Amino acid sequence: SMDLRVQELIKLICNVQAMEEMMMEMKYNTKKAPLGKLTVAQIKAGYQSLKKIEDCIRAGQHGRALMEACNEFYTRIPHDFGLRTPPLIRTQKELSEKIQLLEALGDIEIAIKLVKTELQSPEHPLDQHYRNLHCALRPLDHESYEFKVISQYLQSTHAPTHSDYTMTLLDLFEVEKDGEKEAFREDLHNRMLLWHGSRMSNWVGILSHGLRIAHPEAPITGYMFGKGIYFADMSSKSANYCFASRLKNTGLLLLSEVALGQCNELLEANPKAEGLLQGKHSTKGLGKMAPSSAHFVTLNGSTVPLGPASDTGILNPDGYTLNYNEYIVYNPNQVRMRYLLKVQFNF
Ligand SMILES: Oc1ccc2c(c1)sc1nncn12
């Protein structure tokens, strides 16, 4: 039967009640728009509505035109603000939160289809849920070399500007998504083992379908370097995207092999960065701080950029400089998911 540590992981990520609660925390109205009736049509219409809001934000047009565009969004994607006036979506940050909400609904839509029982199946439902992921998860020995390198990568690349929590590694799984090896660009140079964080609602989607580029209808300004798959070399930069809290302080972190090839190195946000590649295989947003190559090690022949991070001396002379690197590939065939960390956030 299923390892007890794998059963606990599946039970955790397949919990629809937890998805309901995360959605209610993001102000989505699960009473008016239940997760059972969630569709890709509803989400796509939501993205279309956020595009009009993006246009108002871009132009500095608040007031009544913004209020009308926001009502269309709240009609297409029901929210619960109780007795409060529904707030305007006014800042790029606010727009990003609504893109993240629709990205969460997309992975929950996948989860609701997958976390179904068949009468005829002789399997416990938990077992059926795991089989339906088409993704092997194997628990690793805490005395193993891999666990030691991954513990060090987690701790040594916790950024100094993310001092509101530490992370304790509760457990570690090897990930083997069916088909991901066969698809992967093994040929490409510059293969790095990099971080990705996501909300607890998203892991069924990510493990069963892999990391995916943003929806085509999503507002382009939601994406600092366009519609690719985003990774960090600093554990805490990625772990901030877990959105864990004091009350929900268990999250997951993913390590993937990312075939970066030649990076187009950029100093400032450019949502059209995908077009600027021109023969290059990835975008690298340069940070002020990064692990130094003197501390690099390998795991399964991928480079692990162990910290501590130090000043890169990179500055954007005409803009904000990223504190930390980020890596964007625009094709899932440049990603191979490899490890899944069960992380206790110490707030
Ligand atoms: O601009 C971004 C957006 C998302 C994102 C990063 C950079 S690095 C990372 N790790 N998990 C999620 N992410």
Author numbering: 233 to 579
What text appears in the publication on this structure?
The human diphtheria toxin-like ARTD family contains PARP and tankyrase (TNKS) enzymes that can catalyze both mono-ADP-ribosylation (MAR, mono-ARTs) as well as generate elongated and branched chains of poly-ADP-ribose (PAR, poly-ARTs). The PARPs and TNKSs form a family of structurally and functionally diverse enzymes, which are involved in the regulation of various key biological and pathological processes such as DNA repair, cell differentiation, gene transcription, and signal transduction pathways. PARPs and TNKSs use nicotinamide adenine dinucleotide, NAD+, to transfer an ADP-ribose (ADPr) unit onto target proteins or nucleic acids with the release of nicotinamide. Here, we report our contribution in identifying a set of compounds based on a new nicotinamide mimicking chemotype,triazolo[3,4-b]benzothiazole (TBT), able to inhibit different PARP family enzymes with submicromolar activity depending on the substitution pattern around the central core. The binding mode of the TBT scaffold was studied through the synthesis of analogues and their complex crystal structures with PARP2, TNKS2, PARP14, and PARP15.
Based on the comparison of complex structures of PARP2 and PARP15, 16 has a similar binding mode as 1, but the catalytic residue of PARP2 (Glu558), not present in PARP15, interacts with the hydroxyl group of 16. The hydroxyl group also interacts with the Met456 backbone amide via a water molecule. In addition, 16 showed μM IC50 values for the other active site glutamate containing mono-ARTs PARP3–4. This is consistent with the crystal structures where the hydroxyl of 16 forms a hydrogen bond with the glutamate. 7-Hydroxy derivative 16 is of special interest as a poly-ART inhibitor since it is both a potent (IC50 = 44 nM) and specific PARP2 inhibitor with 13-fold selectivity over PARP1. Structurally, PARP1 and PARP2 are both able to form the same interactions with the hydroxy moiety, and therefore, there is no apparent reason for the observed selectivity.
